[PDB]
Amino acid sequence: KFDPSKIKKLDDPSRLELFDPEKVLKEFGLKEGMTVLDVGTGAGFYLPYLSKMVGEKGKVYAIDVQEEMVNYAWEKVNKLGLKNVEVLKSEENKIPLPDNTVDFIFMAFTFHELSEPLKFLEELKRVAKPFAYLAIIDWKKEERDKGPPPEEVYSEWEVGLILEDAGIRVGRVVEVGKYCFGVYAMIV
């Protein structure tokens, strides 16, 4: 799990150097009116983005298993005036949402942190509508002059395999700005 006392590392405007937030989202299919789930919301860094992209009509559920991250992200939305965002306290494999409520699922740098992936994936489909798109973004499994140790992350290869076990269908796997990759998946 990410360390709560290092949270400022998640609220660093220099993260933009990894990839353009709305360029990537728009390309992965996030649209106005869509209800999006932000799994490891952390500091709520990408929240201003997701918020903007769904607009007045959409909604953003920002979850996180850690209470400190939840309250930090919350103060963030209020500080910035993000009215369509709902920050919630999550449990490892349980999302506090009713079935078929999400259109877009965004998982930024949080997949490799899941205790029990395929079990979390099942919980994910539940809250996910029959349609639903899954956008998973993470670090490459090599060595980089900017990201965490490789044994600490999955490689695009492993991830998309797990998704397969879980039943999710992967359609695209593209590099994301020199340090990360991204995966396009649709929930069945």
Q: Tell me whether residue 52 is annotated as binding.
A: no
Q: Tell me whether residue 64 is annotated as binding.
A: yes
Q: Which is closer to ligand SAM, CB of 70 or CB of 187?
A: 70
Q: Which residues contact 17 (CB under 8 A, 6 or more apart)?
A: 146, 177
Q: Is residue 9 a contact point for ligand SAM (CB under 6 A)?
A: no
Q: Which is closer to ligand SAM, CB of 42 or CB of 160?
A: 42
**Of 34, 110, 121, 160, the one binding ligand SAM by CB under 6 A:** 110
Tokens 């869509």 sit on residue: 34
Contact 54, 33 (CB under 8 A): yes
Q: Is residue 139 a contact point for ligand SAM (CB under 6 A)?
A: no
**Binding marks (x or -) toward ligand SAM, 31..50, rule CB under 6 A?**
--------xx-xx-xx----
- Beta-ladder partners of 97: none
Q: How far is the CB of 1 from ligand SAM (least distance, A)?
A: 5
Nearest-angstrom CA–CA distance, 137 and 178 = 13
Number of H helices, E strands in the chain: 5, 7
Nearest-angstrom CA–CA distance, 187 and 23 = 22
**Of 25, 108, 136, 153, the one binding ligand SAM by CB under 6 A:** 108
Nearest-angstrom CA–CA distance, 60 and 80 = 14
Residues in 69-88 at the binding interface with ligand SAM, rule: CB under 6 A: 69
- Name the residue whose CB lies closest to ligand SAM: 40
Q: How far is the CB of 171 from ligand SAM (least distance, A)?
A: 22
Q: Is residue 1 a contact point for ligand SAM (CB under 6 A)?
A: yes
Question: Which ranges constitute the DSSP H helices of the chain?
Answer: 21-28, 47-54, 67-80, 117-127, 156-165
Residue numbers of the site for ligand SAM (CB under 6 A)? Answer: 1-2, 10, 39-40, 42-43, 45-46, 63-66, 69, 90, 92, 108-110, 113-114, 120
